[model samples]
Target: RRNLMIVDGTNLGFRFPFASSYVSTIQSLAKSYSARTTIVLGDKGKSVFRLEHLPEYAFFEYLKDAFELCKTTFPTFTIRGVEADDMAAYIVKLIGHLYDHVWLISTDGDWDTLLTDKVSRFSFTTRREYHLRDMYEHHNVDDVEQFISLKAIMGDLGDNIRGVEGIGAKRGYNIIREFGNVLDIIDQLPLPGKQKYIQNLNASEELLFRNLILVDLPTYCVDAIAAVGQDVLDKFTKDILEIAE
Candidate 1:
């Protein structure tokens, strides 16, 4: 079976010094999986795509030596034009079909939406896999797409996006669990839950959509992304390589 491992370089860079046996741990994990390809993606210093849209968005600088370690330790890629999150999203969508299983290493909740039967995520802090079942049980959602809706209503404080007041994870979870998208519920609808959903949604319509855009992946088609992933493969030689390969 072909295995593809995608590492979030920024994720590791943030805690390089803190991680015991960072290099050995990462290398050992990849070896255990018998991965055919491993690729590391880092963030540009600033994400113009997000900043231009949300001025309040804050960017944190990664530790200098830590970033250097990430670059030197793996076949790393950092596109000046895009953030690591975007790169990861694009990579997963584009060439995910090429592998028997795909592994994403990051603790970002945003990556939760990428999980599937064939795709798994490893948390550095938890030192465990966040699988499809884990998402269903802990996140209170059955489908990954619904997680995007939940995130829209719940917002991401880390990214400086705020959802409506009073509607936290449980409420968002219940709403999306019952109704597909919170936006689908209406103000005049009979259900009280839908009424409450609309009430909050209408109040923050603009912000909610902005939050959705921030949380959602780019609209690029799979074919286009696959092409980009191919270019990425060609540009960087990988010790662990492409899902499609």
Candidate 2:
């Protein structure tokens, strides 16, 4: 079976203090996964789209040097104004079907939005593998979209993206499980509840929508691809196609 491994080079680099160790880990992962093709995606800088919204946001210099080392080992991509998350999403969207299985290498929970039957993730941080079938078990949601909705409502303190005040992960999960996705929740706003958090949620229509753009990988993938323009896309496609051959 053919396997394509898309690595979140930045996330993986967090565990390795040195650039050489990072490169060694990539090589080890390729062999362990028996990947026919491996692509390492790194964040060259802060996300342009994200900064436009929050005006806030790095090991970034070290990671950049590590990414350079990865280039010698695999087809690595580090595009300015783009993100590793968006690149991983775009590559999986583009050529996931050509391989029998697509392995996403990342520890960030945001990558959960990309899971499918054919696509799964391995987190170095947790030392656990995530699959679509275990979505509810691991993420407390029924589906991938709910996972995105959960993030939208809960916000990521790590990324500095704010969610509805007073709504934590448990409440966020319950809200989505009961109300449906973020879009559905938008229409049913001002939900019946006396709780302060519910009140915060009722008034958070605008924030929810904004967070969706910031939190959703698929949404960002489209914008990032277009923002970077055609030449980068062409080069990314060419590199993957050449590897597939």
Candidate 3:
């Protein structure tokens, strides 16, 4: 019954910056997965992704390299640059009339606030989850954005956001497991382990990573997604999107 799917492209790639193996992992994940996939990347995502955002002349060359890498790794994938999270947000927002179940896949916490009325969160490394027939059902069910927010409170290593110090996963999990929020047990919880990284809660770095995590990324449009015109769709499908291989 779902009509549209919004994939968070940059969030997927940002997981492993130093490890190419993870790159291959993502490449394989994007290719092997079967569905009408759309990749939402940001303005500066060229530098954030496999493509090098070099000078004007080097831009094309870097694009070629990235295309080669993508094709070699994720041969069957389809992608396009989006202006920002709002672009993808608008895509899902407009598609509400067409698709009853819209899937929003990404690691960005901002998507949590994006067109939630029409979105089904399929965030993080959704590696063994999609299917042509399944239509990424589980992705539509999980509370992904909350997961990031929880990570914010729990401390995400990927973005280097720290949480309550001295409080490892055990204490944090114990609190969340019982009361659902750290604050739920703040007054009664053992201070011996709770006070360690609590300072992180007030740190500015948290704001930085929070902003980074909230980025919607650059996209092609904001009013609507996918072209209605066949010629335009074809151009996007072949050139802007997948090469139809």
Candidate 4:
């Protein structure tokens, strides 16, 4: 009856503290809407109780523990972990087919390929409307993908991955407004400066895919992560300890 909410796990992993009611809002939304939600975490999920490597490991341990509550209390919620960018992208695209409305939750613009008029998106704290006008509108060119292809030229510094050199947001917007997608720009303008810059850093498309996987929510919380293992309880017990408080 309800749709699915694909949550970005790494964002939650880093963003949510080890408090008892962490993710309460997300949980509430999923429960009220009866929306089947999925959270995809990253490969390096911050060492937990089984491995106390840092101050944050306790949170990781807490997460591993709290996951049990999430799954049992919110049985509809699904979680999984992915190895690399390719796998993450593959998974998001794969599961997206099952749900009528796929809501991708992340601030990364690299996922422009996945955005559709039918699909709603929630980035960071902002809801669907905020990104639509700003990101979805600039395209006036063709489609969201075309807009993305344009932004690729600008080479966002926000992301660790690199893109076309000597390109900025304004120029990128201009290119999109004029030519459209990357191929269009490559064939028409293809200036010596931008051309050479692009040539030096080929495979931006693949890189874009990879970036999506890295940032996109995967299915790590499912069979992969363990909630109550003897190995974990021995190490990081801070959150578990806080229950009595």
Estimate TM-scores for all models: 0.77, 0.89, 0.38, 0.55
> Per-residue lDDT tens digits of candidate 2, residues 144-204?
9988998888888788877899987688888887889999999999788999999999999
Candidate 1, residues 124-190, lDDT tens digits: the string is 7877888887776757777677777788778877878877777776777776666556456433233
Report the number of the highest-lDDT candidate. 2
lDDT of 4 by residue, 22-102 (tens): 457567645644566444333343323213211221277776655555545532223222222222344345455655665
How far in Å is the alpha carbon of 164 misplaced in model 4? 4.1
* Poorest 10 consecutive residues by lDDT, candidate 1: 219-228
Model 1 residue 6 distance off true place after TM-score fit, in angstroms? 0.4
lDDT of all predictions: 0.66, 0.84, 0.41, 0.45
Clashing pairs in 1: 37-240, 37-241, 38-240, 98-243
Q: Which residue ranges in model 2 land beyond 4 Å of their true spot?
A: 17-20, 57-65
Best by TM-score: 2
Which whole-number lDDT from 0 to 100 does residue 166 have in model 2?
90
What does the lDDT come to for candidate 4?
0.45
